[PDB]
Structure formats: structure tokens, C-alpha cells
Symmetry: D2
Subunit: 475 residues, 4 copies
């Protein structure tokens, strides 16, 4: 198997404490390896090292740092098959979108380097403001914050790790990197390649273990200058609460509404709804989790959707199944408990209320109501609920009633109204006539309300991991 | 003389609690007037009244929003006499400087407005990124965050209040506004204008009360979408820790250093320091608070500075004096304790240690050590410590040893070295051959470490009051 | 009362040295409105030099001072919108409220121009951003005025298209030699009377007058000129580009904007917009709907709608705000007729108009117009609107792009995604979806391709055309 | 040996005229190869072929365009050993620096493509200007100009070709390309890789022939939508005079001044000046070509300069000598004329005025005056004058009196002072304590006055080969 070490100041080490955590494959239950469970003291060592490595790192010329991201991305790509195999086993992701995770990461890395390389400064004259003297000029550059705490979830163990690391590193920051436990092995092998690519000692520090044990020690630590975090809303809110006096970026849970209207292409609506709701078996923060369909077209759409839900494969990740088993029992019983509240309240089961351990069949539900839990709570599994609506006004109200606000879809041939409906939605991104999604990666990515704080995507990521530095000359 | 009311939902009202708070002048102690003290009922009412008004405000044409700002600024200019003078009685700020405060704010508002109109969107095609879609276009725009809590200090009652309010309203947030209790009667009048200019009902809510009593409910209230604060560093800490899941902008204290080399113009350098440290009796966040002078010129710099300080006038704001009374007797006492510790630890008194009540003679202190408290602690009073240093490297070290990092000044004829030093300083803004200042307001403004959180200025305040709003379309590919 | 105008040079209000003048009349009345000096080749020379000498002292002025000049020039304009207003009404035969409306628009343009220059910012770049580059090098990129700007405006908007070129020139630190149209010099001068009184320094703004045919080529070829901005006919614009040398030339010329009308279009709006767009200021506008392409399917009820609205347009005098007022002159009217008379003879359907009493042409609608007819291509600059019936959008695009012009276009259809896609195939500056064509709002970039123009306009793009990159490289 | 065919519509052809032009290696006067002298009609086919192809090419998704540039650069890199050799023999460019030219070309192309990938549009809203409707929205993208005419010189037969071609194509223009006759073989090979990269038919056309013969027709052809030119000032002015209604960008000659002041670090200065002046034996548009030195430190600078100068290697391009034979005999004689004029007027010869055919020694000249031709005329050869200057004002004034305004250098310890001296200088780019140069290639590059028109550099090229396309949507 894979009994892994962690990177601190350029060497691969274990816990001094000698203790590990076991990592199995969620689909088969089979042993993949282990990771060190690090103490708070080993977390102090990581943080202090990175701090000291940053002072040398910020000084490196900008092209030196981008050359590193480049060398790292090249390495990730030729390891796509292998890092790919690992991811799919570790977190049960279908083989192809798991190999495709590594490629995409490499792409995010280079594009991130490229965009760093053209952050320019700006000059301002004093007198561009009334009063302001004719003879002073402000030179405004961009400065790294210090040490970045980057915490990533299970569902994109490489992509969500690198998308935080890379904009932090290329802008002169150093990183302390905490992968989700399920996902650590893939995080580590990603960092393996960053160091074979010649990364300097201490610039990237990996901390592993008991996210419930070391979690706060990381988030509250004085050596941490900024935090990037992608995960659940609960853990998201605790970080926000327990970090202080530092920039903090959060991308959290979603309950992305799909508003389907009178005059939608129902074939395309159906294809896009399914594809968005059932990708990686519902286990995505950005995904359709809610459909609000006008009554007149409801039956048509619901049959259109049911037909595609029946098409979907369900089985092994090594097979490229559409539906694969969810992450653990915690999750699988939570999903099942959501279908439960729905059924015993009037919901019509249109398809697959089946459960084979962690393998949960693609569940489609009709006649869902405000009264039901599945209407509001992020399941993180392969269950989709359909709500029947009188008009767009009802669809917007129920959209905005969610505490979530990541992305929304509008399906309508009437493009003008679709844009004006979107303005009324309280989310980061609206998608007209298409499924919600984080990519392509150069597009800003954000949620609001309880879905997040801060803005990601290539260039917003770089912008948030730096601050303005001003030198005012007096000619 | 001024028993102010507060604006809730378009109406100038009192508290249902019946209770007021008297505000007397620090220059003497004569009573200027009073301010409502609101309960957790009237605050939640304001937040509700602000949250609901923003649904209509946010859908207004942006051009209508800016006009309210133009109309509000003009009204303030008309009233620079009556309102500028309220400031000088309230926070005891020199008359000319006070009227000048009201002047700068209108400019700030109009320039804020002007920038709002140039807030363009951006478009992105999907295949601008590897494997992305040629037939997708993101319409990226800005969107208001919602209800902004604007908290401001006694420092700049009007200036620093409207500096938060104007960018917030123009981008289509509504505002719940908490002035400093002292400085409230000043901010209130400032608002009277915004309401006179025609402000829609509820877009600007004015809350008033003891701050130590009602401030934590405000900070943690789930109806607030964004906090912007300028005040004491202690209270900043509170806010950052008690808020969560919202943007938070804090502007906090400073121990701004001046570094003076051998190859420096000792007249200009001296003049900049006395201008920047002793302005409004040093009761500014951005102010030269400690000088690191090379000892080869220490004798010469200290002399230059001793002279100009002696030329500063001591008295009442009505009389436009250079040195005015500090805010209250608490502050007065804390400053004296900073002098006494320095002097007990072997510092040199160069100019007036004297004080008359809350009026405190400007104090020059030489041969100050890292051992003395005044070398580190922000006095917020008319005291200036000179610390003799051997070179630039030792001056950086100590400068950087502070928990503060707002602004700095490096004085030298050699400009290449000053840029090279500046890069090594953990501050937001470096001033070559000039004092530190927040102005001009279109310059980015930020402190690092314990000095602040986030960025400001005209443009950067606007961005901080907003978020990306992306719309992604399909494009047709073939008709032909 | 007769306004006997003088022109301003080097801070002084002067006459011609020869004393000779050009009389200027009301086109809608016949009455003399005043006159203008007529200047020698050598008075042109005294203006230009006196502007080169001024510019060296004006570029040094801090930006806020230049901005405060624009702001005070705008204020007086607004304050004078009634007198300047009424004058334009007379001098170019334009409705009263759109005369005043021109002045207000102008004072808004100036003010938005002033605040936009106030926001031009420098850039810094490090050497190693490009591969191989040095990390020690830092470029400070700024913007330097070009020097002396020749601003030439037409009779269309004698104030607005004059200032659209002056205000962005002056505020960035250029000086201006301003050549207005003869018909319109009076108003153009009352505009500069206003810049005079705001406190403009000597030599900053030089007015030159005289017939373009006389003094024009001298002005255009003059080595003292650093940049030209021109608004007028396609003929003159072409000539200017041919004669100008070694300098940025920005031109906005004629247009034959199509309105493309697909079958699924809302037809009461489409007609409403086309009528407002074709017949405003009686068609004498570079940006105007000058030809309609409509699918056969809906061709009949559209043309019926258009015809209804044409018959409600008031015709006559500028003082009573007639929708249609008399064209610019008889030569102007005779060109229009020859275009109508060609269409009539070549087989076209007259639906309305062809009435006239001298200068005052009634609104004219032409159905069944073909590519065989001149009026399908040639800019009439008059109150006539041809309609060309078409099988589908592919033929409309084709026929749109066959024209020499490419200023603006309008696409009327309920299918927005398609209208965008169709627009991308139109060789024009700006495509308007479900709306008429127009130059503004003024912050929108405004330009023609092909024979419609060269270089970009609109508030900001104007600002950039009248400056150039200045670059200081430091070795840290 | 290299009998080049040219590229039309994806086929490799000789001329229909049947005529050819012999190209000889300037180091040895031996035959290298030949090129076709096209007719006016072959130039017309070329223009038409690219006009057609543009309509399909402008349509391609941005990423596809970008992708071709990349494949082209990887092939040029792969090919740097053979193209560099060909540049070396065609233009007598020191071996390594010719290869380096190809490496510089690949870097410029890749970066260009990357910059093109980052061109984003902007949305403007109606009421962003006073009066504007709240309910409409302008989408503003960049649209290609059409067919670009790219004219390149001899001394960067690839880098200065590609710097034009690369951003033309990527933003969706097509290119008609006139390389210098001397250097036409390098270009053809540069283009061979582009075709090998899979450039669709007609997006890149190569026209070879006498600029004296085919140049005028080409520059005046209405199929041409833009011209970009690097060469002499005399051709540049001719081009600008003759072209019309299209954008034109010129990079012309220069006489780059080095100002050396009292506090100058004279070691660094000497170094910077000899490196900047004598690269490619002075056969560069940007290069220090005159020195204004304060007479207080003059004798010392010239000594330092002399040591380095007498230390430059003189010989064949194959041997990587610093000083290589100049381009042709015409050149060698125009240079001889300038030395003679200076000596025959008093100047001090401090280092060689010695020849072997076109192989000239680096000549240094002291005691140069504003009366010698070499004070002013661009030598385009290994000759450097030094002028004794009282103070900075003399330095400034003497700099500006020149017709050229490309770049300048300021040497002094006082960096504030070097900035304000920079301000008062009428040039494109001022370099503090460093030589003049075009690079790094993302930096804005421009001449003013007789030195240029418009702007180059990576991103500014992209902007100069496109224009705004507006689409106004209506959400009400
Ligand atoms: O009026 P419109 O729409 O009909 O446009 P236009 O006749 O082409 O005239 C536009 C502007 O250019 C001037 N002009 C005429 N001929 C010129 C020339 N050869 N060179 C430079 N400027 C010239 C005109 O002055 P004039 O009014 O004297 O023609 C007018 O100011
Ligand atoms: O080479 P260089 O540095 O010495 O500078 P140059 O003589 O001005 O040549 C620069 C470029 O301009 C071309 N050219 C020559 N005559 C022309 C004309 N009449 N019209 C348009 N282009 C023309 C040249 O072609 P040729 O090299 O064939 O003259 C060459 O490609």
C-alpha cells in the first residue's frame, strides 16, 4: 500500500509521536495507506518554517516563482494516470473525471502562473483629486501577505488544493496545507511533484491528521496570515468565528436552483439538470440540487429527466460509473434520512430509492414542498427534488429563501427575461440555459449568504493573496 | 443647544425609551446638546428598515444614486460654517481645520460618485482557458453586498463617516450608521443634509447609544452584511472576533515612524515631522509618532524640531490654535503617564511638559529607548519621541518591531536607498521626503498587522462594498 | 439682432487683416443672421504657431487646473443654453428644444470628459515579466499630449461635435486650432466665447474660419499640426486622410445604417424606432437609419406601420418644434430629389411624401426599393427612407455588407441570441438590438469602419487618441 | 543554395513574370539564393487571397488562433540552428545573436498569444452617462481590422517580421507580408514553419520584389486595412503620405542621445554606451548614436569608452565578432562620408577609421559639433560621436533639435534629476543609467516625431490591430 510521510522544510517525515491514521477506499473498503497524525507542536514547526522560508521566497524574482509552478504542472501531467488512479480509489471518483482532475489542475497552475506574470503596478498623481498637490506620485505594487493556510475538501483532493496553493506561492506567499483526511494521500502525491520540481524548503508545508483535533490550532494560529478553505458550511462558520484579524476566504455548501420556464427547450433542460445534479453522485458544492419548474411543463420535464436518470450507470469508480458510492456511512444515512422526510410527506418517487451500502441509486423526487427537508438541506448525494411552481415569481422567492447562494440556472428561450430574472437571484453566478459549474477556471467563482466569503477563479485568487503597497514620491 | 434626533426609516425621531445622552465641549465643558440612546428594539428596527429599503435602492438607476451624492455634497458645502464649527466645539478641532473637514468630505463624496459611474463590467469567453467553451460568455458585473454597518470615531466626525457611507450608498447598499457618541451631533448634522438632499426612506439609518452597551448586538446582528470601522485598536479586535461570515474593514491605530538619514534636508525633514505629528494634537491615526534619527545629524535635527514646536500656539479651537485640548481627561491622563515613564527612565524633556486641564502643551522627548513605553504605545496626544539610531538597518528593525504598520516616512536626498528601505518596511504606505497622511483620498489606504484590515481610498472602498456578479450565456455559432 | 462675429487668436478677439467676410443666413427663413471673418493662409499660420507656443506652457499646468477649466466652460454653457440654443436653431435650421438640448448635452460631455481624464493612470512593469527580462528594470508608463490638435466640426451639431473634440484635447494638455463649418461658425464661436469667459489662457483655443474649400488643405497639411479630428462628409474625410501626413487622424464620416427586421420582430416597436431613427433632424445625421431590410413575411404590415407614424410627423418651422424642418440648403435638397427621382423611375413604390416647398422637404417613404437604385446606397442626408424587401437574414447581411459604409446597424427580432450572432457578421462599429442607432450615450465607444471612419471616439477613446505613451525605465 | 518560392493561398509559387532577384551574403559577396519579383497582379492575388481567408479566420475561436502561434514558435525553436545560420549569412549578423534572434522571436510569439488570451471585453450601461437609459447595455469586444500589410527591414528579418505577423493573426486579421529583399530568405523560412504549423490557406501571404517597384501599389491598394512598417524615415514618410483611410504604424530611424552628467558612474556609463552603440555594428534603429557629455568628466568617459571600443572584435559573423561587415557598399560609403565630414571639420579620431570592403572598424569621434553631419544623420554603422556639453540644458536642447525622437539615455547618480531631464526630452522612452533598447518586448515601444507613428510592444500591437465592436442590448 501507501504509507506516506509529510513535507516539512524539504524533507519527508513522520510524526515524532509515531502515530498514523488509516485510509481506505470508500467503494471497496480496502486499505490504501496511512498518514501521520501530527501534534500541535509539529503544526508549530510547519508554521514557523514557512514564515522563515517566505522572507527568502518573497525576494525571488517573479519569473523564478512562475518557473516553479510550470515545472510542477509539467510533473503533475505525466503523473496524471498515477495521481488519477489514487484519487479515484481514495475518494471513489469515476476514473476519467479523476484523471481529468489532474490535467485540469495542471492547467489551473499554468494559467495562474501566466496571470501572475502580468499583474502590473499603477501610478497616481496627487492632483487627480481636488486639493491633492501637483507634485506627488503614488507607486502601487502588490505585496504577499505572508503564510497561507489552505484547507481543502475530499471531493477535489488535488484541484481544490492546487487552486489555493498555486496563487499563494506564485505571488510570494508560503503555504501551510491541510488536506481533508480522506484525500490526504492524493494531496500528498500532488505535493510530491511540487518538490520533485525543486520547490524550496519550507515554502510548502503539509500538515496531516484529525481535522477535529488540530483544526482550530491551525485556524487560530498567530503565524497564519490568510486562510483559504473549501468545505462544509458548519466547518466554514467555525473558521470564520475562530480566525481573527486576517483575510479569510470560504467556499462552502450549495443548493443551486434550476428555474425552468414555460418556453424552455425541455430536452436540453433535462440533459443539463441531470448532468449537473448527478455528476460525482451529487457530491459537489456547485451542482443543481433544486428544480423549480412551471406547472404547465412539469410533466414533460419530469419524464425527460426520469428517462435520463434510468440511463445513468451506477457501480465501480474503476469502471467509470455515472453514480459511484458516496463518501461514508455518515453521508449515506444522511441522504437516506432526507429521502425519508420527503416520502412520508407526499413526495412522489419517480426513480431509484435503492441503497447497496454506500452505493445509493439515483433518486428522483417529484411534488416536493417547502415542508420537506430535501427542499433546503445540501444532501451531498445522488438525490434530486422537483418543486412545482406557478410562475417565475414563485421560483425566485423560493430560491432566495435558501440560506445558500452559490450558483443558479435559468432555462428559457427568452434570453432577455432570463438575464433580468437572474438579477433578482441572490447568488454568485447565474447560468442561462446551462447547468451550474465552477469552471472554466478563469471565471470568477463565489458564493454569498452562507455559501461563502471572498472570490476565487484564477485572477481573483491571486488578488486576495496580496495587498497593495504604496510608495509616495515627491518630485 | 442641540438636542439631536435620529433618522430611522425616513423619519427624524427620538427613542421610545425616552433616554438621552448629554454632550459637552472638551474645550470647556459647556453643553452642546444630546443624543438618543436606543434599545435592541430600535436597532433591529433600523436593520429591518435598511434591509428592506435596499431592494428598491439596489434596482435604482446608478445615475439617480450618484445624484443624491452630488446633492448631499453641495448641501454640505453650503453648510461648512454651521457644521464645520459644530465639529470644533464637539471634538475641539481647530476652527479652520474643522471647516476644512467639511470641505474635504464633499470632495470625497463627489469623487466617490464620479468613480461609481466608471465601474465597468468585464466579459470573458470560455475558451480563454484550456479546454473551455467558445460558446460561453461570462458577463461579470459588481453587486451591492446589502446592509453596511458604518462605525466611525470622534477623530474625523464627518470626514471618516461619509467616507464609508458614500461608497456604500452609491453602489446600492443601505447603511446603518454608528457615530462615535462624542462626534455624534456632528455626524447627525452631516446626515440631516443627506436627508435634505432627498434620501429615500430607510437607505440611511442612524443609530446612537453608549457603544459599550449596544455595540455588540449591532456587530453580531445577522442583518448586517458588511462592517467598516475606524477607531481604537482594542475595539477593532472586538469587532473582528465578534463578527463572522461577512466582509470586515477595519482601520485602526498607528505608530508611524520617521527615519532620518545623514544625507537629508534637515529643514524640510523637521518641518514635515512637526506638521504631521502635532496636527490635531496628534489625535490622528496617520501621524508620525516616533522619529528614528541618525546620530550624526541627531543634534541638528533635534534642534530644528525644538524650534518649530516652540512656535506652535496653545489654546482653544475657536481661536484656531495649533495645539488644542485632547478629547477627554481619560486620554489626558494616559498621555501624561507615557511622558512620566519616559522621563523616569532617563529621557530628555525638550519642550513643554505643561498642561492646563485637558489642554496639554506639545511635548518633545529626546534620547528615548526601546525601554520606554512612549516608543511603542500610541499616545493619541501631543507628544513626540526622538529615538537616536546609528544607521538605516537599526531604524528598520525597531520600526518593524511594532505591532503597527500603517505608514512611514523616509527622509534622505538619496531616493534610490529610500525606495530600497521602504520595501523592507512592514507598512501600507511609504512617504519619501514627506510626512504620513491619509490624503489625497484617491490614494490606496491600508494598515498591515494590528493597524487595519482590508483596503480603502475612493476606488478600493467601492470594490470592498461590492462583489462579482457573474452571468454566463450561450452564444449561437451558426446562422449561415 | 445681427451677430457680427469675430474670431479669437492669442487671447484677442480679432477681425481679418484684409477685412473680408462671409455672410451667414437662416436656411428656414432666408434672413441674415450675421457674418464671420475670412482668413489668409498666413492668419492660419499665426493661429497654429501661437498654439505651439501656448501648448508648451499648458502641458505643464497641473491636471486639476485643466479640469477646472472644462468645468467652468461647461457651467457657462449650461447657463447660456437658451441664447446659444436659439442661435443653433437659426443657424442650422434645427428644432428649438433639440437646439437647447444640444447645449445641455455638450456641458454634460465636457464635464464627463473632465472627470474621465482625471482618472488616467500610469502603469509600472518589471522587465522579467517578458521571458529573459531583467528583474532590476521598471517601466513607468504615462500619457503625454501630442501637441497641436486640429478640430473640424460640421453643421449637424455645431456646438456638440465641436466640443466633443475640443474638451478632450485641452484637458490632456494639447492646444486646439478649431475649424468649424461656415454654416455653424456663429454658434461654434458663441461656444468659444464661453470658453474665453471661463478663463482659457491665450493661444490654447484658436478659432479659424473661411470656406473649407479655401483654407482647408493648408490647415490639413500644416507641419505645425500634430493630430486631426474631423466630423463630416465621406468625400472631405477621405481627402483629409490622403493629404495629412505622419500624424494620427481620427475621422467620423457618413453612414447608411441598415435596420434589419426579421419575421418574429415586434412590429409596433420596430417601426417606432425606425421612424424616430431615420427622420430625426429631418435625416441630417451621420448616425440615422437610412435603409430598412424587412423579411417578406412581415414586409407589408411593417411598411404600413412606418407609414402611419410618418403622417403624424409635424413639418415646418424650427420655432414650433417641427419633427421635419427644412434641409441645409438647395444644393442639399437637389441631391435628395435626384435620389427620389431615380427610385421612382427605376420602379419603386412611393408610399408618402415627394411634397416640397423649396427648402422644406416633406418626409418621404419608398417601398420596393432595389440594389439597382442609387437611393439604396447613397447617403441622402435628407428626410427619405427606402425599404428593401428580403427573403431572409443571410440576404440582409449580404446586402448590408455590400455598402461602402459601416457606422451603425439595428437588428429587430425577438431572438436575441440570433441578433447578436447576426450582428457579429455586420461590418459596422455598433450593432443595436431592438433599438434605433445612435452615437451615444457618449461614454459608449463611437466609430465607423470602411468609409464610415477611422479611429475611435466616445468620451474615453477620444481621450486616448489625443495622447501617446511616455515611458521612463529605471534600473533599481 | 536557397531559391525561394513565395506563399500564396497555401501554395508555394515562383512569379508569373518569370523574374528573380539574386540575394548575396554581405560578409563574402557570394550568392546565397534568390526570390521571385512579383507583379502588381500577383500582389493583387495576394491581397484578395488574404481578404477571402480572413472571413473564415476571423470566425475561429480565440483558442484555435492562439494554438497556431504556439505550434509555430515550437517549430522555430526546433529550427533556431538553421534559421539563425540563414540570418547570419543573409545579413551578416554575428552567429550567436542571429540564433538568439529566433529564440527572441519564439518568446515574442508565445507571449503575444498569451496576451491575446487575456483580452476581455467590457460592459457599459446606459445611465453611466447623464441622461442615458438605465435599461440598455453595450458589450464591447475587440474586432480584427481585416488584412494587415506588414513591412519588415533587413536587420531583424525575423523578429521584426513576426512581431507584426504574430499579433495580426492571433486577433484574427490576415497578413500580406513584404520582407526586405535582403532578408527575404530568412522571412520565407520564418513563414515556412508557420505553414508547417498548419496555417490555413491564405492567412499569411508573402510578397517579394523591389520595394522601389511593388511598394507603392501595395501601400495604396484598397484591399489593405492596416499597415505596420519598420525601416528608414524616408520610406516611412512615403508610405504615410501615400496610404489613406487605414491605420498606419511606423517604427523609423533614430539618433538616440546619451546624456552623461557630473555625478555619472562613468564605468557603467562607458559600458552601457559601447554596448548600446555598437551592437550589430550600429545597424540598429534604437542605439546610442550621439553622446552629450559634461566637459567636466568628458576626457575620463572617452578613455573608458576607448578601452572598451578597441576591445571590440572585428571580423566575420561566423566567428561571432562584435563588429561585422555592414549590409552593403551604399551603406559603407554613406558612413565614410560622415567620418570625413567630421574630421574635415576638426573632430578628434580616437579609434579606427579603417576599412576592408564593407567591414568597418568601430570609429569613435570626439570634439563633434552641431555643424558636422554625424552630429545629426543616422549613420546606420559602427560610428560613435561624442559632443562636449556645458550642462544638462545644452544636452537637452541639442537632443530635441534633432528630427528624431525614438529613445534617450540619462546617466547620473541623482535619480530625481534624471527623471525631470527625462520629462523635457521629446522621445518615446527615456532609460535611466542604462542604454536605449526595444526590449523587454512587453514594454511600450514607440518613436515620436520623425521616429515613429503609433505604438508597438506585445499588448499595444494587439490593440493597434483591432478596433471596438459594440453590441447594445435592450433589457426593457
Ligand atoms: O457639413 P458637412 O456634413 O456637409 O461636411 P463637409 O461639407 O465635408 O464639411 C465638414 C467640415 O470640413 C470643412 N472642410 C471643407 N472642405 C475641407 C477641406 N478640403 N479640408 C479641410 N476641411 C474642409 C468644412 O468647412 P466649410 O463649412 O467651409 O465647408 C466643415 O467645417
Ligand atoms: O531595410 P532598411 O532598414 O534599410 O530600411 P528601408 O530601406 O526603408 O526598407 C524597409 C522596407 O520597406 C520596403 N520598401 C522599399 N520601398 C518601398 C516603397 N516604395 N513602398 C513601400 N515599401 C517599400 C523595403 O523593401 P526592399 O528591401 O525591397 O527595398 C523594406 O522591406
Amino acid at each position: 500500500q501507501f504509507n506516506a510521510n509529510i513535507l516539512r522544510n524539504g524533507e519527508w517525515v513522520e510524526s515524532r509521536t509515531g502515530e498514523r491514521i488509516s485510509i481506505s477506499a470508500p467503494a471497496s473498503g480496502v486499505a490504501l495507506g496511512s498518514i501521520p497524525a501530527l501534534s500541535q507542536e509539529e503544526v508549530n514547526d510547519a508554521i514557523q518554517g514557512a514564515k522563515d522560508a517566505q522572507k527568502i521566497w518573497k525576494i525571488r524574482p517573479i519569473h523564478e516563482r512562475v518557473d516553479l509552478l510550470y515545472a510542477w504542472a509539467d510533473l503533475l501531467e505525466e503523473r496524471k494516470e498515477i495521481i488519477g488512479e489514487l484519487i479515484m480509489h481514495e475518494v471513489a471518483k469515476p476514473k476519467k473525471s479523476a484523471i481529468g482532475e489532474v490535467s485540469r489542475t495542471a492547467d489551473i497552475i499554468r494559467h495562474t502562473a501566466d496571470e501572475a506574470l502580468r499583474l502590473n503596478g499603477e501610478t497616481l498623481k496627487g492632483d487627480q483629486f481636488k486639493g491633492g498637490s501637483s507634485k506627488k506620485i503614488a507607486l502601487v505594487e502588490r505585496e504577499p501577505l505572508g503564510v497561507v493556510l489552505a484547507i481543502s475538501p475530499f471531493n477535489y483532493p488535488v484541484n481544490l488544493a492546487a487552486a489555493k496553493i498555486a496563487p499563494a506561492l506564485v505571488t510570494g506567499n508560503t503555504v501551510v496545507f491541510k488536506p481533508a483526511t480522506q484525500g490526504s494521500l492524493s494531496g500528498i502525491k500532488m505535493v510530491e511533484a511540487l518538490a520533485d520540481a525543486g520547490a524550496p524548503e519550507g515554502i510548502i508545508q503539509v500538515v496531516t491528521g484529525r481535522g477535529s483535533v488540530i483544526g482550530d490550532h491551525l485556524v487560530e494560529h498567530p503565524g497564519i496570515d490568510m486562510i483559504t478553505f473549501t468545505g462544509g458550511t458548519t466547518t466554514g462558520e467555525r473558521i470564520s468565528e475562530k480566525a481573527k484579524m486576517i483575510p479569510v476566504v470560504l467556499e462552502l455548501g450549495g443548493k443551486d436552483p434550476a428555474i425552468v420556464l414555460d418556453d424552455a427547450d425541455l430536452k436540453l433542460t433535462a440533459s443539463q439538470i441531470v448532468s449537473g445534479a448527478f455528476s460525482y453522485s451529487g457530491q459537489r458544492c456547485t451542482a443543481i440540487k433544486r428544480v423549480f419548474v412551471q406547472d404547465s411543463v412539469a410533466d414533460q420535464l419530469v419524464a425527460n429527466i426520469k428517462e435520463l436518470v434510468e440511463q445513468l450507470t451506477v457501480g465501480s469508480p474503476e469502471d467509470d460509473a455515472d453514480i459511484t458510492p458516496v463518501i461514508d456511512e455518515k453521508s449515506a444515512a444522511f441522504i437516506q434520512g432526507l429521502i425519508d422526510d420527503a416520502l412520508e410527506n407526499g413526495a412522489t418517487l419517480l426513480s431509484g430509492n435503492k441503497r447497496q451500502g454506500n452505493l445509493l441509486s439515483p433518486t428522483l423526487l417529484d411534488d416536493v414542498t417547502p415542508a420537506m427537508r430535501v427542499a433546503w438541506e445540501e444532501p451531498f448525494g445522488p438525490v434530486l427534488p422537483i418543486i412545482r411552481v406557478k410562475d417565475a415569481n414563485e421560483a425566485i422567492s423560493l430560491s432566495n429563501q435558501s440560506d445558500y447562494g452559490l450558483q443558479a440556472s435559468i432555462f428559457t428561450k427568452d434570453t432577455d427575461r432570463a438575464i433580468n430574472i437572474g438579477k433578482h437571484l441572490e447568488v454568485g453566478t447565474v447560468h442561462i440555459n446551462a447547468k451550474t459549474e465552477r469552471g472554466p477556471d478563469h471565471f470568477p467563482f463565489l458564493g454569498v449568504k452562507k455559501s461563502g466569503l471572498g472570490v476565487q477563479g484564477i485572477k481573483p485568487s491571486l488578488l486576495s493573496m496580496t495587498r497593495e503597497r504604496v510608495t509616495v514620491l515627491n518630485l
